[PDB]
């Protein structure tokens, strides 16, 4: 069992695709193992660069294929290098840009924290255990930069497992177990653009929508309700266009549905207050109580949705 | 007739393109057959990896081309492997990402269920019957995940057919029949984002549009109708932008046309109630009957469109 | 002059790009000719698959380059095959996906019928006449499917011409004439989504815009005109976003300009009726005549634009 | 100095990218020179097609690299051909699709005329003067077609220059001068969609905005001003979405800013007319003079912007 | 230590991607070093062009791999050339189009100035010090052209550093130090389209929004406030659609939030002025003071945001 020692350098993580759950990683792979004691010119390490590798493998060199289990498609391998020492050591270095995939949950959209995962595994060998994994990730930013979309929390976390494929069953003296190197980087979204542009103005719009009860006659109250509802649909479109596509309702979309509910409740209460014989036009005490209780009730249901969302 | 035994692993299905009817599948192919009893170093299976295959086919190895009948373009084959046993067995393993196509019917758009289909077939041989197909699909999600866009119902369904090409007619002692492996995965859309954001608010808007009859004078009734119609066109745009493109009207678009019809009917009834000499300004009993019958009539036609849509 | 016999299979036509006038075709080419009587193992047809062709051409085989004259870029040739019979016959089969181009006229946009054209021609030979063309197109749909964007009318129409290049003039004993295979498929757009969503609601909006004359005082008439014009600009945007880009006005855009004209005429007539001393506020017979004649005049100009559009 | 004789065929020019200043050209290159008197089978021209060229250059053939100076990236060279005559002549023919770039000025956007430019130059030789350039461009359209986005004025204009690179200075007996072939095609945009959809409706909207002065009381005048301004912002968005992106204001955007200015001036004049003690509610002669002078003043500033734009 | 002398030519910089922080550069690389005194035909420089290089490296030529540290993916290397002099000199010339990345701060969006950076470094050698860097950048434009999106300030600034990789530690007699060539070009955005289209109209809209206090009765004041807020949300959408995506609030977005705050404050003050018993309908001196102080207060907070933004 040849022991392969891996080291992954991460240069940048970007381009998260919310609907396809795929991000993009760019960096380096350095896999080092020990072979036979070859002889090299000058008794110095020999360097084989990009296209001259493929004429070294044809001669009989052993370069395994380390594939990314979770990549989508095929990584855009740029320059690759292969340095052969005299005592046997071989160091295969390559630069990759891949569009990886994971299982990400965007339900708390503006405040969510994700976990970017790379999984590495030899393509075709099972007695080639990957011996020791290291990540240098110090090139993301200075530290959780305030102009960055994703603040990365702490260093990357590595792991080496023995994945068992129970469908192969070739001879099965433990002949279907592949070593696997999993790395996870914890990231947190930057909730600043989505808090000062999409949540504050919507809070202002809803709180102003409660002012319709402050008017005087029934006709103008019910008239300006329709304008308010038009405002809300315009805002709902504004938000929908900018925000990423998703198959489920985020935190922001629930605020918009709450706005729709608030305006519909305003129309219902306006109509009811107009058509009760006790308070048709006389002694309209219902409207004052409504001004007292409508904001409190909406804030109660807002706290309910917050507590059911954070859970 | 060499018997090829196939096994397809599905890793992820994503990126459904509604207008082009093409989805994307990523996974593995494992095709295994039996050849001549070759001799290998150490009497162990020999592994040939990516670019060293093409110098084994030139020497005289027999590796058939298994093509996907329904793919669009050419699959983005990543790592490919070829393992040659001593007793004869050959196992060709490859990783593919392809943009497949089918005949999908999105007419019940938010509640539709589709059938993702892969079709596999040897490119150039007719006496190479594909012997036995298997699918392992256990890597989609845990099970019909609530954060997934498509819930996959049950295991995949396989089939092996003998497609006849009646245009070749080379010699025709059954010399134009190709074996074919068809696999179908039943999927169901996740109708949660499209039910709490595009259908509930539109129901609220229409039900509020019926409130225009509750006003007092003709001028203000007909005035606020125009604002309502502006609201509906704004909503129709909001819906159109988010939803996928299609050549026919889904369930949601029929709700919007029903909204247009409802508001136009409201304007017609307002005008008629203003210009009948029996009920010009006197004894306006038509408006009350309208408040009684307009929502019921619209709900009747809504049930009609629902029953004609589910059929 | 070697006679090449062609057969083109069409699997799917999709992705029409209105602004660039390019569509996409996916299918097969089968070109068959007769060469020298070679000797093959077993006296059976020999099959040469994808990458092993290029080491047969280097040995001295004659495989001409059949190019598509009107393709854009280079077709995404997938699997290609080459079957060599003993008596001489050679059959070159290839699978192509190309983004072809034509000269399409989208002026009657929702009701237009186009003609998809493929043009094939040997790249470098003039005494290689293409002998006989066939198209099997039976894989588009069942027949003009109701869930399809383009209904294809009838079978494909083929043609073989002798294109003359008058700029070469190499020796000119008819040494600058290339055979050419042209195929045309007649297609008709599916005018169902564009008729129940973009034309019916606009008809309703315009017909409701004529109701402004039914109000009572001048101030409110001219006030609700502005709201109507806002409605129309919102609709014009809705239509513009969904519809394809074009350098000229389709049928739908003319309806929107007619709507703009109708509302501007309404404002002009409202102002004029307010400021005529005969009918300032007294004996307003002009408004009634306007209600009689405005819809008829607009319908007349609509019939005029229809007759000038269908021509 | 080998004299290379060039001939460029243009098949189609499309896909102008206003923000990146890159268009796309598709066509053919035919470069012909004279070499040594080789010997060919049958004493006839020998044709070398696509992938068999690269095994003729390795043997010692001289095929220079003719690069496009101004291309972006690398042209998508499709089929390439190379015909070797016995007396020496060599004719290299290739089909290219490239995304070229120029310095285009879109300031008069809907009425602008551009100049598509291709620049050709040997990649590495300076004593390889390009002898004679020809363009056949007769395949654009029939002539300046009315369904075309760009009407091409007249034939293409060619030029052969001696570009001097003053930074090389290798030996400098005129050892840093490269021949260059420049071709320019004059094109004119089709100002029909942008004149009947984006300019006429905006003229109507502005001319209707001047009607606000025709109302009666101050409150309703200033009220309907706000609706007008909303109309204009909606239109400004409609225009912005369809039109191409640019770093400077076109002709259309200046009309929208003029609309904003007109409505703001209307509000200022309404307020001033309400708050002058001479004409508070009495003897309102200022409003009539305003109706006389506001359209004339706006038309004056419009003529000013037109004269400063055409310059 | 072979001294490599570099010279980079920049042809165009375009396509800045604000959200991914990647721009695109197109140009040439010229790296020149001195090797052994080879023998060439005719004792003249020998030119090796595109695909014939790879058969010179296989023979034993030494061509290092100069990689761009900060590129994203792999540059689209077009034509490459290699000129071998007799006395030893070798000149490797290549044409590249790459999508580079940097750390750009778009916080002052319309008035920001950026610094485009290229970083070059040998892929695999540490004793190959890069000796002397030069940039010719004279092909951007004439000078800071008024039709250009980015005005480039002054010439490019170069630098040669010794980057130390402290993780290699192979033998460490200074065996982990790579030379690096960094080049920086200072660019300034063109703030003309974003100043006459997105800032001037918004200033006009806000300044007109202050006119609501000039109306007479409470009902109409609070009514036209809602229309104003709808105007602002429409404008906020217009701006959001055109402007680039970002994870933080630019200068323009702060103006929109200020507009939201101004209109909400207007509603609050209208309501308060309606419901104070001292100035319910009598002696409404609060409204006049509000007209005096509201614009001044908003301008004060605007100056505050400007001073906190420029810092």
Automatic annotation (TrEMBL), chains A, B, C, D, E:
Transmembrane segments: 193-214, 226-243, 255-272, 292-311
Family matches, as Pfam families: Neur_chan_LBD
Single GO molecular function: transmembrane signaling receptor activity
SUPFAM superfamilies, alphabetized: Neurotransmitter-gated ion-channel transmembrane pore, Nicotinic receptor ligand binding domain-like
RNA-binding among keywords: no
UniProt keyword Membrane, yes or no: yes
Domain Neurotransmitter-gated ion-channel ligand-binding as annotated: residue spans: 1-190
Keyword terms of this UniProt record: Cell inner membrane, Cell membrane, Ion channel, Ion transport, Ligand-gated ion channel, Membrane, Receptor, Signal, Transmembrane, Transmembrane helix, Transport
Stored CDD domains: LGIC_ECD_bact, LGIC_TM
UniProt-listed InterPro entries: Neur_chan_lig-bd, Neur_chan_lig-bd_sf, Neur_channel, Neuro-gated_channel_TM_sf, Neuro_actylchol_rec
Topology with respect to the bilayer: Multi-pass membrane protein
Compartments (UniProt record): Cell inner membrane
GO CC aspect terms: plasma membrane
Family indicated by similarity: Belongs to the ligand-gated ion channel (TC 1.A.9) family.
Subunit note: Homopentamer.
Protein's name in the database: Gamma-aminobutyric-acid receptor subunit beta-1
């Amino acid at each position: 069992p040849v022991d392969v020692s891996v080291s992954i350098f991460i240069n940048k993580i970007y381009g998260v695709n919310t609907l396809e759950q795929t991000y993009k990683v760019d960096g380096y792979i350095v896999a080092q193992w020990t072979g036979k004691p070859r002889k090299t010119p000058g008794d110095k390490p020999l360097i084989v660069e990009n296209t001259q590798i493929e004429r070294w493998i044809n001669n009989g060199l052993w370069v395994p294929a380390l594939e990314f289990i979770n990549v989508v498609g095929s990584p855009d391998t740029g320059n690759k290098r292969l340095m052969l020492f005299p005592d046997g050591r071989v160091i295969y270095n390559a630069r990759f840009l891949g569009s990886f995939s994971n299982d990400m949950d965007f339900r708390l959209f503006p405040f969510d924290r994700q976990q970017f995962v790379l999984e590495l595994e030899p393509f075709s060998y099972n007695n080639q255990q990957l011996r020791f994994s290291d990540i240098q990730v110090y090139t993301e930013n200075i530290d959780n930069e305030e102009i960055d979309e994703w603040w990365i929390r702490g260093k990357a976390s590595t792991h080496i497992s023995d994945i068992r494929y129970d469908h192969l069953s070739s001879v099965q003296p433990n002949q279907n177990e592949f070593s696997r190197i999993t790395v996870r980087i914890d990231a947190v979204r930057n909730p600043s653009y989505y808090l000062w542009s999409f949540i504050l103005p919507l809070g202002l719009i809803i709180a102003a929508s409660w002012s319709v009860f402050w008017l005087e006659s029934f006709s103008e109250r019910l008239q300006t309700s329709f304008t308010l509802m038009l405002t809300v649909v315009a805002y709902a479109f504004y938000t929908s266009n900018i925000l990423p596509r998703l198959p489920y309702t985020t935190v922001i979309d629930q605020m918009i549905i709450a706005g729709y509910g608030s305006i519909f409740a305003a129309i219902l209460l306006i109509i009811f207050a107009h058509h009760r014989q006790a308070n048709g036009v006389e002694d309209d005490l219902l409207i004052q109580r409504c001004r007292l209780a409508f904001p409190l009730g909406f804030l109660a249901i807002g706290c309910v949705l917050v507590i059911r969302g954070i859970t």
